[PDB]
């Protein structure tokens, strides 16, 4: 009956679920277990490049806390 349309709808829904889940997991894999930094404005980019310079490993996402000061 009407539930016969549901397998194709389910396959199409899995195919629409893949890109967002994929980019979320790829952002967390590529950005140290966290969200990708949003730099829409040049201040956010300045802070991100400052984090890349203070990390010492040329990666913005490697965060340095109070252990890096004396």
């Amino acid at each position: 009956m009407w539930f016969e349309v549901l397998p194709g709808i389910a396959v199409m829904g899995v195919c629409l679920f893949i890109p967002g889940m994929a980019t979320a997991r790829i952002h967390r894999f590529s950005n140290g277990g966290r969200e990708k930094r949003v730099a829409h404005y040049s201040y956010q980019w300045y802070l991100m490049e400052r984090d890349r310079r203070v990390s010492g490993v040329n990666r913005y996402y490697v965060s340095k806390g109070l252990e890096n000061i004396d």
Partner: protein
């Protein structure tokens, strides 16, 4: 090579202009001006003009060249073109060769041959795009400009309806 990306896009821009200005057919001329508008948008985007580049896409290519190709499709349906095209191409690549081997050229103005990244600013704008704020100031500071532009567009509507009527 990647430090010269605005220069490379500007070369493709001049090549597209030599493409449509040699005038093969107004439909291929429309295509050449479309490709030129896209790469000129890319130049504008690489100087940080995101909104102005998207205005080239939305208004120039998506608005005006659509109407050009539309009118051309309603109106329409060589050796001079090819020679003119290779002439403009050889002039442009002689310009490229001179300004790359010399890092300086003078056609009418003096031009540096370094990568055009050198002229940029070394700071930040904080929490705004300066270009977005200057375009937003059309409503706060550009009152007279809004008045004369909107009046010219209303008059443009009236003028097109006058001259296309034939009565």
């Amino acid at each position: 090579m990647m430090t010269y990306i605005v220069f490379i896009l500007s070369i493709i821009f001049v090549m597209g202009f030599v493409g449509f200005s040699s005038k093969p057919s107004p439909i291929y001329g429309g295509l050449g001006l479309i490709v030129s508008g896209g790469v000129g948008c890319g130049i504008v985007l690489n100087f940080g003009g995101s909104f102005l580049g998207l205005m080239v896409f939305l208004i120039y290519l998506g608005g005006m060249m659509v109407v050009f190709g539309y009118t051309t499709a309603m109106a329409t349906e060589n050796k001079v073109v090819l020679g003119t095209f290779i002439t403009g191409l050889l002039m442009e690549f002689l310009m490229v060769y001179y300004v790359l081997k010399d890092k300086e050229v003078e056609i009418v103005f003096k031009f540096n041959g370094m990568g055009d990244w050198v002229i940029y600013d070394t700071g930040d704008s904080g929490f705004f795009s300066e270009e977005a704020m200057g375009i937003a100031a059309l409503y706060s500071y550009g009152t007279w400009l809004v008045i004369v532009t909107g009046w010219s567009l209303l008059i443009g509507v009236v003028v097109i309806m006058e001259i296309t009527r034939g009565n």
